[PDB]
Structure formats: C-alpha cells, structure tokens
Amino acid sequence: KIKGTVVLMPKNELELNAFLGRSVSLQLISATKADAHGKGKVGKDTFLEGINLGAGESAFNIHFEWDGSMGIPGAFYIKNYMQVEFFLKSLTLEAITIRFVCNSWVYNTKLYKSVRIFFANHTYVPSETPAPLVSYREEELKSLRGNGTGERKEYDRIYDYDVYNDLGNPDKSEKLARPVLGGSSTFPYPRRGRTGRGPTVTDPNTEKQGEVFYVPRDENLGHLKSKDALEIGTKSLSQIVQPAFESAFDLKSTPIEFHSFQDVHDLYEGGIKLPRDVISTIIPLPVIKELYRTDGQHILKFPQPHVVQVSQSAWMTDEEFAREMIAGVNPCVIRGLEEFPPKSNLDPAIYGDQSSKITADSLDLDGYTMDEALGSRRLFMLDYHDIFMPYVRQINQLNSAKTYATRTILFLREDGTLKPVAIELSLPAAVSQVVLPAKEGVESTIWLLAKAYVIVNDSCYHQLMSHWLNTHAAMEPFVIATHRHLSVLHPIYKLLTPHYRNNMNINALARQSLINANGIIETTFLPSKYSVEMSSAVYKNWVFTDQALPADLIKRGVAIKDPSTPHGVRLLIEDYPYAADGLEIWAAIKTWVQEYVPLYYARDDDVKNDSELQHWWKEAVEKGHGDLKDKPWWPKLQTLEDLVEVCLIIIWIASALHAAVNFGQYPYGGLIMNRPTASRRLLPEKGTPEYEEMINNHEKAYLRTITSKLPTLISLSVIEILSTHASDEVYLGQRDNPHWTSDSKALQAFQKFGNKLKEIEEKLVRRNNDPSLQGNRLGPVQLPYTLLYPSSEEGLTFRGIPNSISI
C-alpha cells in the first residue's frame, strides 16, 4: 500500500463526511509499466477513507494497493459520484514523495465524456515522456480542444477561438448593433474564447446575449473572500449600481453638473448625498460596498486619489501634465521628434493636407533654436492626430461629445524634465489652431482647456489601446493556444500558465459589461459606440515583437540602441520613470527565461522538434491573431533564441506592462479633472457667453468641457475596482504552489529570480529617494513612482506587479 492524502476545497468555500464512503474514487496510473496495449497500467478504484493546510482546504487519507508489478505512479483518474462539485487541489503519495498539483474543479462523473486525469509534477517535452504516459498526454490535449461546435456549459474545459461578435445587442435595439471585430481586413482583431450561445434573431452574425459568458471551468476563478471577486464587481456596477445612479439623476436628487472644482473634491471629502434607496442598493453588494465609505443611509464618499494627497491643485501645473507622459497611467505613447513640423501619414487623397501648422518661432525652447533642440534630441511629442482624425467627425455628431485630434510638442529641459511648448487642436483639410502656454488671462484658461483635450485623447487611447488591446485582448489568443497545445507536463506550459491567471475570466466579464454595446466604456468615454472599433484600427499596426520594452523605446525614438549600456539601450529622456524601472524588470525576466529554457532544450533542433511547441505557436498566430497571420515580423520557433524571445514578450505584457498601465488608474484618474474621459464642447468663440464664463469662472468652463457628473461617478467606481489588488493576487516572482515542478534546477532558478526582484525593489526605493530624480519621479504632486515595485499588499496601493492580467 501507498499512503496518499488528497487536499480538497468544497464548492462553498470558493463560490465533510459526505466525501467519504463511495463518493470519490481515484485510480492510479503507472508511468513505468504498461499494459498489453502500451498504456500505463491502471489500479483499482480506491475511495476516500477518512478526514485528516490552507484556509478552506480539507485533507483526506487514501491507501492504494500497489505492487512492484505496477511500477511508479505518474498519473491518476478520479471519479466524483457526488452531485456537487469540489475543487481538487492536490494528491501527495508517500512513494519512491510524489506530488500531483491539480487545482481543478471536478464535477459529477456523468457530466464528463472522458474521466478526469491528473499527472504528477514532472516536466517532459513530448519526446521525453515515459512511453506509458504518451497516450494519456495526447488524449488529454485533444479533450481540451473540443470539436468547434456546441454551446459551452459551465463544467466544460474546452478552449477555442471566436471573433468579437458578441458585444452588440441587435435584438434589444438596432441602435445597439456593433461591427463584428475580427475575421476581416476592415476590422482585424485578436480572437477571444468561444462561448457558443448561437446567433441573434435579427443578425445571424452576432452571438446572442447570455446570463454568464462562459470561460473554461478552471479559468473561472473562485475566491475565498467575496471581497476579492473584483471581476464580478464590473458586472454588478453595470447591471445594478449604474441604474441606481441614473435614476437619482433623473430624480434631480443631486445637481447633475459639477459647478466648481470643490464639487468634485467633495466626493472624497464629505461625500455626495444620494437617495436612501440608492445607498441601500449599493451597500449589500459584496465587492461594491468595499468601494466607498457610507453613513448607511445617504452619503457615499470615494477614497482620496493619490494625485491630490499632497497638493490638490498640482495636476494643473504644466510640469505635471508633461511628467505624467513618462510616469503616469499611460507612460508609453510619447515619441521622439526628429523633423519639424510633425508630419501626418493620413492619405492625401481622402484627407487632404494634414500638416502641423505649429511654427518653430513661436516655441519657447528655453533659449534653444529648433535646429539646436532637434539636433540635441530634446524635442518629443504626444501625437494623436492620425489616430483620432478619421473618427472626429463621427464622434462630434454624437450628442454631448465634441473633440479635437491633438498634437502636443514637448521640450526636454537642461534639468531633464519635460516642458509642454505647444498643443495643436485639429478638426476635420485639417482645420487647426495652435495653443501656446499662458500663465494669466483668458489665454491661461484656453491653454488649460487645450490640455484637457489632449488628456481626453490620451484617456481614450489608454483605456482602449494601451490597456484593453495591447494587454487584455492581445493575451487571450496565447492563453487558448497554450491549453489546446501544450500539455500540463510541458516545460513552457509550466513557465507560461502562471502569467495567464484570471485573464480569460476578466475578459468575458469585460465583453459582457465593459466594452459591450451601451456598457461602461461606451457610457463614460468619448468615442461611445466607436470605442472598440477604434482599437481595431490601431490593431492593424500591432507588431508582437515591438511589444518588447527595448524595441518599444527604440521604435518611439525615446531611446537609441547602445551596446555600452547595461541594457543595450540609452534613454534619451534619461530619467523616464516607466522605462528606467521597466528595463530593470525586463532584464530580470530575461535572465529567468534564459536560465529556464536551456534546461529543457539543449540545441536549436530540440525546439524545432517539439511538436507541441510548433503546433502551439502555429495556432496562436494562424488562428489566435489570424487577421495578422501573414505579417513578416512573426518569430518562427526554430532556435533557442526565438523561444526565449517569445516567452519573454508574453511574460512582459501579462505582468509588468499590464501593471504599469493598470494600477495607476485611480491614483491619477480618481480626480476627474486630471484624467477626463470625454470632452463635450469645442473651444468658445469670442463674444459669446461661454467665452466670458472662461474669463469669469474658468472652473465652470473646465467642468463644462469635460466628463459630466453622472458618467464621472461610474468612471471612478470602475477604475477604483481596476486599480485594486485582491488579497489572493500572485505577484511576479511567486507561484501559487511551491511544488509546481519537481525539477529542482528550475526551482533554484526561480528562487534566484524572486531574490533578484527583491534587489530591484530596493534599487527602485533608492531611486525614489534620490534628490536629483525627484523632478520626474515625484513631480509637483509629490507622488513617488512606485508602479513598478514588484511587491504589494492588498488594496489601492499604486505598486505591485501581478503575474498576469488579473484585472
């Protein structure tokens, strides 16, 4: 007999005597002894004996009869005869100890076509699999693929691709019809996980609405504390809290418009007085109640955002506006200008002349001439002109939406901080007006409004492109390809799967409540129905290999290749907080991947020879990012170096890149005037009442231009959810189970990686305490750039890099 202990979590802990008797049987499978058909020998049905660790877990003892004729166990089957599911965590066998790290829900046997199999934590590329286990490895992969047809049920573990044809709602109203994104050249898009609900009545090409948007069962993360189910909070906020708020505004219970900046600051100070019925709707809701402080019957107040914690006015400084382009929520769009004026790439034949009307002579480059500044590489720009100009006429025809496509020119001062020297506002021949900085008079308010247009442009780009497309949407193809093609035993599966946690789940919740027709992003952001459409337009230019941080910096002209530097790249904005810290994290991940991959792949031919690896990458490109499959820049996995690269970029996006652009959202955006999501008014003409209001009451002028009060309450609640780390978050350099592999050489290398992250955090603390770096790393708001610190505790911390796109 071999003694074994099975760790279980009953459903209720994540959503004992009953598990004993003939309720759960395991059957051990040999890794070293085959039956007369080549498969590993299977043992007798053994049941859970007696009750015998973490919270919610329950251990049970089992004893398997096993003889030397059967060899060494490497896998096991399990049949759950109970009516209710449970979460199987692990099995430990006191043999040879052998550990099977399962972490999987197993429903009643009759709900499965194949009996569930789990393998021990040994890592094997396909050719190194114990021959008894080869059949089992192949069959299990096949099972996870499914046959492409059918409506996905709760208990299914099937991974497949579909197009984003599920966001529109044509049967509720044709006004809610939306383009099918993906599968065409007009609208290319990454694929998402297939759900299979079937077509709508009105449109055979739209998937019909559903109560739950399926993700494969073990992608649907349970949580030991309801508090931590942040993902369902987006659903609750769309379906329950947003109605409640909207009724309060229909009822004129509160002013529908902010009139002064203090009205916005009140939200986190005294709160906002809402009807009792609204407060009673909010505070029973388990994730939603954690978002606000309330007096139980009338006041709701929001956390004070980090950006106002020292100075509640500093966001208004030109210094901060520019500083945030290299250390804010969206620190990765700024580019180096190498010729002046900025040029446009829009087609002359359709758009006419689209050239910057900014004149060099109007620019105060602190004493530099244009030629000097350009030659010294001190001119940078934040250019949203070609991105927004094809959409501006359509956006401006939407009620309460009026925008400009913007260009902002920045000069890098002798002290290393950036200076906004000009904002160009253009409307569809591009009608343009250049707004220069001004400290007093109407002119300072027009400059203030011009910065608001630039940040509406930036907010929309951050949410949709930097955040939705480049991390969430881009990563889901790779999650599906990994499960369909790389076995649980495969090294690269063990390396990659940690960086996928909760990604598919939050995306399905997002399609249902955030980026769906009339969802939260269309309600609170400028493009309204054009929002996800615009990210498709930007996806046309997505390049996977450009997602590598060195490549990104070089491509944007904010760094030059330089062999003599620790990272082979010399930053042109020397203390660019995101890049500088980012390069430290990047290098750490690179050393980890470079140590790991040679342990399983000795020569390049080994990579070429891995059938699973070749089918994984083939499908991720051909099916996953199918609309971009024939683009010349796709790596081919023929060498060790190619595999290291592909693994590195996937881990970078999931963790650090996603951290950098995600967790600073409420820190900086919680004050709506700092990060407005929409403009509603174009710039006032002289001689009209609104021009005089700019002069006499610049704050009402600004509040009139930006996101109205009700959209702001919804906007703030979502980005507060999005900026929160849950207590069950697994951070970079950690694993959920310490026995994720039995390979001690890989485990040692992982321990090194974790220690390297601790060293890097120390380095970063020192940078935050460096008096010369204060200008860009803290700025007028005095908020130390802690966004790329690897560790964090729970809550709205403005620090901590998760392993995955978990929110």
Catalytic site positions: 467, 472, 658, 662, 807
Q: Which is nearer to Fe ion, 466 or 674 (CB)?
A: 466
Work out how close the CB of 467 gets to Fe ion at its nearest, in angstroms, rounded to a whole number: 6
Token pair in block for residue 277: 């019925």
Q: Which residues are annotated as a binding site for Fe cation?
A: 467, 472, 658, 662, 807
Work out how close the CB of 651 gets to Fe ion at its nearest, in angstroms, rounded to a whole number: 16
CA torsion, points 511, 512, 517, 521, in degrees to nearest 10? -70
In whole angstroms, what is the distance from residue 319 CA to residue 777 CA? 12
Work out how close the CB of 600 gets to Fe ion at its nearest, in angstroms, rounded to a whole number: 31
Side chain identity at residue 674, one-letter code? N
Work out how close the CB of 472 gets to Fe ion at its nearest, in angstroms, rounded to a whole number: 6
Token pair in block for residue 463: 């949410």
Binding span for Fe ion by CB under 5 A among 141-149, 381-389, 638-646, 656-664:
656-664
Token pair in block for residue 306: 């980090």
CA angle (210, 213, 215) in 5-degree steps:
155
Binding span for Fe ion by CB under 5 A among 300-308, 383-391, 566-574, 657-665:
657-665
Q: Which residue carries 């606000």 as its tokens?
A: 292
In whole angstroms, what is the distance from residue 789 CA to residue 765 CA? 8
Q: Edge to edge, what strands does the sheet with 431-435 contain?
A: 335-336, 379-383, 405-412, 418-427, 431-435
Work out how close the CB of 475 gets to Fe ion at its nearest, in angstroms, rounded to a whole number: 10
Binding span for Fe ion by CB under 5 A among 5-13, 40-48, 433-441, 660-668:
660-668
Q: Which is nearer to Fe ion, 653 or 701 (CB)?
A: 653
Q: Which is nearer to Fe ion, 167 or 410 (CB)?
A: 167
Helices (H), 215-363: 230-236, 242-250, 261-265, 276-282, 318-327, 348-351
Token pair in block for residue 99: 């550990």
Q: Which residue carries 């630039």 as its tokens?
A: 454
Token pair in block for residue 503: 């990604």
- Reduced to 3 states, what is the DSSP secondary structure of residue 340? coil
Q: Which is nearer to Fe ion, 470 or 662 (CB)?
A: 662
Q: How far is CA 132 from CA 31, 74, 489, in A?
A: 6, 9, 14
Q: Which is nearer to Fe ion, 129 or 662 (CB)?
A: 662
Work out how close the CB of 649 gets to Fe ion at its nearest, in angstroms, rounded to a whole number: 18
Q: Which is nearer to Fe ion, 412 or 534 (CB)?
A: 534
**HSE-up (13 A, CA, CB side) for residue 98:** 19
Burial 754-783 (b: 16+ CB within 10 A, else e): bebbeebbeebeebbeeeebebbbbbbbeb
Q: With CB under 5 A, what is the number of residues at the site for Fe ion?
A: 1
| Contacts with Fe ion, 363-402, as mask; x by CB under 5 A | ----------------------------------------
Work out how close the CB of 132 gets to Fe ion at its nearest, in angstroms, rounded to a whole number: 43
Binding span for Fe ion by CB under 5 A among 353-361, 419-427, 655-663, 700-708:
655-663
Q: Which residues are annotated as a binding site?
A: 467, 472, 658, 662, 807
- Reduced to 3 states, what is the DSSP secondary structure of residue 86? strand
**In the window 537-566, what residues touch Fe ion (CB under 5 A)?**
none
Binding span for Fe ion by CB under 5 A among 31-39, 360-368, 618-626, 662-670:
662-670
φ, ψ of residue 266 to 5 degrees: the values are -55, -35
CA angle (463, 467, 471) in 5-degree steps:
160
Closest among 433, 497, 389 to 104, alpha carbons compared: 497
Q: Which of 92, 535, 662, 715 binds Fe ion (CB under 5 A)?
A: 662
- Position with the least CB separation from Fe ion: 662
Work out how close the CB of 324 gets to Fe ion at its nearest, in angstroms, rounded to a whole number: 19
**HSE-up (13 A, CA, CB side) for residue 210:** 22
In whole angstroms, what is the distance from residue 407 CA to residue 449 CA? 14
User: Which residues, 6 or more positions from 585, have their beta carbon under 8 angstroms from its beta carbon?
Assistant: 656, 732, 757, 760, 788, 790, 801
Work out how close the CB of 505 gets to Fe ion at its nearest, in angstroms, rounded to a whole number: 12
Q: Which is nearer to Fe ion, 356 or 662 (CB)?
A: 662
Work out how close the CB of 601 gets to Fe ion at its nearest, in angstroms, rounded to a whole number: 32
**What secondary structure letter does DSSP report for 127?**
G
Q: How far is CA 585 from CA 171, 327, 764, in A?
A: 48, 16, 10
338, 557 in Cβ contact below 8 A? yes
* 408 binds Fe ion, rule: CB under 5 A: no
Angle between helices 531-539 and 385-396 in degrees, nearest 10: 150
| Contacts with Fe ion, 606-645, as mask; x by CB under 5 A | ----------------------------------------
Q: Which is nearer to Fe ion, 649 or 722 (CB)?
A: 722
Q: Which is nearer to Fe ion, 535 or 662 (CB)?
A: 662
In whole angstroms, what is the distance from residue 260 CA to residue 434 CA? 27
Token pair in block for residue 288: 């939603």
* Number of Cβ atoms within 10 Å of the Cβ of 68: 7
Side chain identity at residue 246, one-letter code? E
Binding span for Fe ion by CB under 5 A among 141-149, 261-269, 530-538, 654-662:
654-662
Binding span for Fe ion by CB under 5 A among 52-60, 456-464, 562-570, 658-666:
658-666
φ, ψ of residue 10 to 5 degrees: the values are -65, 145
Which residues of the shown chain bind Fe ion in the complex (CB under 5 A)?
662
